[PDB]
Paper text:
PRPP is synthesized by PRPP synthase (PRPS), which catalyzes the transfer of diphosphate from ATP to ribose-5-phosphate (R5P), thereby generating AMP and PRPP. Class I PRPP synthase is the most widely distributed in phylogeny, including E. coli and humans. Phosphate ion (Pi) is necessary to activate class I PRPS, while ADP, an allosteric inhibitor, competes with Pi and ATP at allosteric and active sites, respectively. In both models, PRPS hexamers are stacked in rows to form filamentous polymers.
Surprisingly, in type A filament, we found R5P at the active site, and the ATP binding site was occupied by ADP rather than ATP. One Mg2+ (Mg site 1) coordinates the C1, C2, and C3 hydroxyl groups of R5P with D170 and two water molecules, and the other Mg2+ (Mg site 2) coordinates oxygens of the α- and β-phosphates of ADP (active site) with H131 and three water molecules. ADP binds allosteric site 2 in chain A through hydrogen bonding with R102 in chain B, and S149, E133 in chain A, and a π-π interaction between F147 of chain A and adenine bases, and salt bridges between R102 in chain B, R178 in chain A, and phosphates. However, in type A filaments, the RF loop is stabilized by a variety of interactions, including the salt bridge between R102 and α-phosphate of ADP at allosteric site 2, resulting in smaller B factors ranges from 29.4 to 44.5 Å2.
Residue numbers in the entry:
A (entry chain B), B (entry chain E), C (entry chain F), D (entry chain A), E (entry chain C), F (entry chain D): 3 to 196, 203 to 315
């Protein structure tokens, strides 16, 4: 008995996933009270069932997170069998340590503790900001890479001796993995000091593919593209998995030298961003549906990591 | 070493409490990141200290709650000694059971579990919606009544043989307590059936004092006042502790037959409500400051329940 | 594999429930050692089974509670699958908060913690004193109302314009629910001050039905009946779910003006009470058997709340 | 701030301990409600204090145990600093394993879990039935031997080449320890087969000292004394720490060949037993008072194990 | 789906058990990294399976224990259904209490806590040093006696009026059980004082069977055999379950008066010990295989305790 | 009351730290039993004290880890006040996630859970392999960088326009931090594909400083030095914090082109490595002593992160 439930964060992605599983979303009233508190009621029998909840903890982050945890509590008190939280974008993942013992929280651990406390039995995410967040849980956590879809899109561009560039130092590992997958090309690294951007590697007369896990504001992405074009690069493409696009992202991307921005659909796009002519979206519904299928049928999940 | 910290929910109440304790609020940067996630940094040494956090979980409820739990986590990882959460208004307290085994959450228990998980050592609240929420925690919970302040204000009205009325059946116990405190007057009960309001008790030619724990939308309060005046009551006064005032509350209170609405300051008022000429606010800063003083000095807290 | 086990608190109710499920009680030796400590031995295979334990925590309360928790521990170490505690009367439910921060325990929370610690997976009760005790547990708790049986008995009395009266202020909500179920009649409230009883509502020349969750000593019930008859009421009937009947209850009920006392069978009656001519018992075995049937077969439990 | 509290199990022992500490027992109302549920109220400030609760879990075992756990919960919610449970006799200690995987509970572990759940910080006991019960807790457990007092009494008897006998096989280790302390005498062992008692060791023409941790019914003790006298022993003395004396113990001890029965005061004696002419009581109040003194002042507890 | 996995501690015993279950060991790479840290990889699907891990925590104890806990963590994160730890010899079982409140650990409790923390669901052991270690866990623990195999071997020796001797005082209970099983013979006890060995019981002209749970160094066993032969015993046989054989055990057994040493196979023997001509090994693979079979099929485990 | 205790892993480092704190190491017997199990006895009063345990979990890793956890359990049962584990090198830190959902453990989380279970209150480490391991704990974890000491040593070399090189992609962040501290020089990255080493950045005619967190076998370090010298680098220096030096490290470093290897003293060096002429050791005893001093006196720990 596989049952799918959705929040208000990613309803269209949940509908696409349900379509690919040839089922329909479970019936649950999830809204707000008059004063703004989350209201949840499960409107069908879930006793002993195998429940999947699809919801990203994207902006508005706190409302979406409260929605998810309140759904889990409601399902657990209604005697559900197993609850899997499908969280395509995991919010608060960038607050994952205390640098220099700064008096800051580790909020990703706080969220993992909340999810474990309400009774989640498994978590399925896409491209966690830090892979070590798998260890913040006691339950199995499956971190699925979005790189197959993005690489499939890259290979249909016919790039001229492309080079893979990471816009910052934190993305070097991911950029190297993408480069090894992309016909084993070269990689370059953007190094930022003091306000100048230093490029390590040769980009003269080559197509540049900027790869990142997310695009939050686009300031550093636009600056990296500007530096790459100033050092003589033909075309610049930006590939990311999570389209956060917060703050002044639309204006930054509009007045930029990037030829194409390609993102996945873990977060719904705004009308502001969708109006842009050079922003393209790929879908992860098939990959997530296959992962849900394998989890539900007790099959091996390692098959999801092939290109 | 008593240190006070405040969130963004009730900063002026926290400042008043700090003034009455002859100290100043601790220095902590509490704001938002670009995408809307809560940002917290404690900017002073708190090692081994006795920390009090003042913040209501009022609207926007989820942001305020996340702010509180993230502050507690940051303080606990910074080696604070004891953390007391002063929550003048406790949000989600109305979701306290599952009626008829409805597939709903018990969200007050979820919030209590979150607070216990991040490391709170004591909770101090004002007029919990259900007193049994004290049992949702393992830590001491002090539920302080706001009835001394409201009764002091009532006794300066010179009411003509007043009668204490509860606007619904859930408030009968509180209304009876207020009536016994108010020179041992009579009490009447509003009974609602089907859309008509039935009044049990005699209100003909008497001043009526409606007492409630909160005013959320004011619809039932205005209806009760209308019924009381239709059964021949001279003047109607509304007394409450928590001024939620959500939805259409301002228009409901403007076009109403209530002579005076008196509330406490557990939730800041909007400009919409503050423009109203017949809404008056009492302060709880002295009572909360005395409670904090007694907790900090290891004195008996039972002295707080005298009129 | 549904297996029923019984303690020494309510053996005849357990036998009736087993009869209605067309099974027999499981074989377990549950007694005392020489010095009075509880002795338990499960005398059949329970590995992987779906176990229901039927036992009220009624007087002697502590022995019955220890019996229940020791049974649960014995079954859990014998590799039982799922353990449901059917507790028709939940003892210690009246100690559910600390009024005015009195240095008292919250013993209902203590008992819930004990039950959760030994390994109970679900609780099924009848008419909890406070519904918020559902939140004292992490496991599902089904609070089943006894009002269908009592209302069925009420409707066979042919009352003359009956009015529903709550003997105290704590029972107003339940009395209102019963009144709305009883052809939508009126309700009156007994208000006690200082030693006099004040009645809010008109009872002149009407049949009065006193409704309560329990009858502990009968002092307040007899006083309320006396006041109702003094204000000119034709007949007084007392309806309750839990027949505790402690202290001087038999003498109070014998020298009283109540025409009929009707109770359920969550607690066995003594010979003292059974000798009384105007005390009648209704059975809850059918309702509890249906609830157990629905829990065992993973059906919806919401069907149990219809009249 | 050392505060002593007592239950209703061992009030005179608690008073003696308080006398030896030159303090007085703390003021707390500990009784029963009308229906038999435990009632507790702490009538003094205990905030931040160092609390000791003196109560044996002796017969009636379940009432005493519930009294203790309810006291601990009340003190913990009243913000006590540290709670030490002084349990001179630990009930349910004989149910400490499952022999041959019998479907029985391990009730000593259940009681340890209850005590840990309510918030006990340290346990102090006398002559635990199994020393491994120390490992049933997470908190420090100090198991103090009563053998110094009993050995002091033995050495004032002027025994004629005494031999130390264990009435069963479970007491051989304790009997050997006593024998090594008693001028390094010999030891004999009572072996019971099938209904006959086999004695291993020579007892012809010697004084026999039977040593045990407890005397529950006295049947095996009287049988062992009978066998020892039949194999030609001059005088038989019985020494034990815990005087349970359940069932037919008084008649067994009256019609027995034992010259003297000496016990400690961990359990109050009945009038039935106190009427016996050959039963003598030693006091442990000094030893327990010294242990409490050392725990309170953060001194080494190893000094308590010298003769 | 029963799956067997083995560590590096007892691979041949695991292979024998797998042979008797007519299955094969599961495929898992369990070794060491370059620096000596344990490396584990499960090389087959275990989702929802019923997993048994066979590994003794014998010398090198800490490596074997870490191997076991790391395997359990790997299997739990791979979504295994139920994990049973089959630990034929349980290391650290001799550190089971704090005698005289010595500042020592209770390491058996530490190991039980580690096993419970990684997610073990059941433990199956052979001849625990202290049976109360069953209470150190929350999960079912089945302590299976090795006495059937040893008694079967004893009865094929044709002993001349044998007497069962325990080499120390801690083994008296086990020696008595063996004696009652061995045609209800007599038992004698070795008592050690100061450096001399005192024998309680008559051994003149009888065959002596020394029975113990383990043989660690053999010093006390050889001394007991020497004393027994000095008091005129014909032949001395040593029977034990766990062949630890540490330190100078081989030289002690070589220069000893023991005619035969018979042990089980819970710990692999060294070449040093296997070279000895009078050391014989019995197998427990059949008994453990039957226990695993009964656990897997949800049958009663009490059938394992018959001779 | 600050008390220092040491294991057998890093006794000389512990002695140096004790010397810099002008105290002496606490008296505790920490060794092995005959069969190889860890033996611990605390030989002084620690009641209420502030205890620091200094021990790296270096090779033999499992013995050292068991030593640490057993010490913590012994101290916690002896009523210690606060226990801080000073672990200069944290073993198992490289097993921090499951790549591609490989059926592997997260052993760093297992070790963190063990430490939290025995009762550690704070952890102090040096240069954790992954900083996110701070989130594997609930307690404060202070990750102190060793870069001040190494940078002080670097600045006394008089390098000719040095360039900072990371031997692999996982060390790029640390290499960049070191480069920014080292007069804001340039950085180069070693990229390994397929067996060839690709260098991103210009190293022609410059001094190269290889920086890493650890040196396990030295194979990749020697290969990186060889590649750097083949692309025309004057001198190559290797700087690391943790000198693991496992496997064939001594032969790799002997037959290498590295001019100097400088490491800290978190792990004792072998005689094999100490015989090498171009391996130099720096001490961290002063920095760790200052950190312990600040923790003990409740001072801010942020002062430890300045150069
Ligand atoms: N403001 C208030 N003051 C006093 N009691 C209150 C108040 N609000 C709610 N209550 C509840 O009303 C109940 C009345 O109990 P109490 O005041 O002791 O009188 P009695 O027990 O005689 O009815 C208490 O249990 C308390 O929890
Ligand atoms: N026997 C009963 N039947 C129905 N409700 C009851 C009963 N006893 C107590 N109650 C409580 O009375 C409250 C009345 O709510 P409800 O019956 O939904 O009507 P309304 O919400 O319109 O007042 C419920 O929250 C329920 O918890
Ligand atoms: N009253 C007692 N005094 C001393 N030991 C006792 C007593 N009762 C039981 N014992 C147990 O007897 C065992 C004997 O150990 P010990 O007295 O150290 O001598 P040895 O170790 O030489 O046999 C101890 O482990 C202790 O737990
Ligand atoms: N020795 C070190 N000194 C400083 N930072 C280090 C060191 N080793 C690793 N790091 C990491 O490098 C990251 C660089 O951040 P930071 O030094 O604040 O500069 P920026 O944030 O401008 O890149 C930090 O998050 C820190 O965790
Ligand atoms: O917020 P921006 O820097 O503009 O863009 C998002 C980046 O911030 C984080 O490093 C993310 O990993 C991205 O690299
Ligand atoms: O939301 P409204 O009914 O308009 O006003 C608030 C009321 O709703 C809850 O019962 C509260 O206790 C109040 O009585
Ligand atoms: O103990 P009595 O007051 O005599 O009768 C039982 C009552 O006490 C509690 O309020 C129960 O709810 C009943 O109303
Ligand atoms: O119950 P009885 O056997 O008569 O006397 C008490 C004995 O029962 C237990 O073994 C105790 O340890 C005693 O040896
Ligand atoms: O270590 P040894 O004394 O030489 O032989 C093992 C004995 O040590 C323990 O008591 C075991 O139970 C054995 O009796
Ligand atoms: O084991 P080696 O690769 O030879 O040297 C140690 C390296 O292995 C890990 O990445 C460490 O971080 C080091 O970079
Ligand atoms: Mg990052
Ligand atoms: Mg980035
Ligand atoms: Mg309500
Ligand atoms: Mg209301
Ligand atoms: Mg009540
Ligand atoms: Mg009542
Ligand atoms: Mg025993
Ligand atoms: Mg005995
Ligand atoms: Mg032993
Ligand atoms: Mg032994
Ligand atoms: Mg790494
Ligand atoms: Mg590396």
């Amino acid at each position: 008995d596989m049952k799918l439930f959705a929040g208000n964060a990613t309803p269209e992605l949940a509908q696409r996933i349900a379509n690919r599983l040839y089922t329909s979303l479970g019936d649950a009233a999830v809204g707000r009270f008059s004063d703004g508190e989350v209201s949840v009621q499960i409107n069908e029998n879930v006793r002993g069932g195998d429940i999947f909840i699809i919801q990203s903890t994207c902006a508005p982050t706190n409302d979406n997170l409260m929605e998810l945890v309140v759904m889990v509590d409601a399902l657990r008190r209604a005697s559900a069998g197993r609850i899997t939280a499908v969280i395509p974008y995991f919010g608060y993942a960038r607050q994952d340590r205390r640098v220099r013992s700064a008096r800051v929280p580790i909020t990703a651990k706080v969220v993992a503790d909340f999810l474990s406390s309400v009774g989640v039995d498994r978590v399925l995410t896409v491209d966690l900001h830090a892979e070590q967040i798998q260890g913040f849980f006691d339950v199995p956590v499956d971190n699925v890479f979005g790189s197959p879809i993005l690489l499939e899109d890259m290979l249909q561009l016919n790039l001229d001796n492309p080079i893979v560039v990471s816009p910052d130092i934190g993305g070097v590992v991911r950029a190297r993995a993408i480069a090894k997958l992309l016909n084993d090309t070269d990689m370059a690294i953007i190094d930022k000091r003091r306000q100048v951007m230093h490029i390590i590697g040769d980009v003269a007369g080559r197509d540049c593919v900027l790869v990142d896990d997310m695009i939050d504001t686009g300031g550093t992405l636009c600056k990296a593209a500007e530096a790459l074009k100033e050092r003589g690069a033909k075309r610049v493409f930006a590939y990311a998995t999570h389209p956060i696009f917060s703050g002044n992202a639309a204006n930054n991307l509009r007045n930029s030298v990037i030829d194409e921005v390609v993102v996945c659909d873990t977060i719904p796009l705004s009308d502001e961003i969708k109006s842009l002519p050079n922003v393209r979206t790929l879908t992860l519904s098939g990959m997530l549906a296959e992962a849900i299928r394998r989890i539900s049928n007790e099959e091996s999940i390692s098959a999801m990591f092939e290109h």
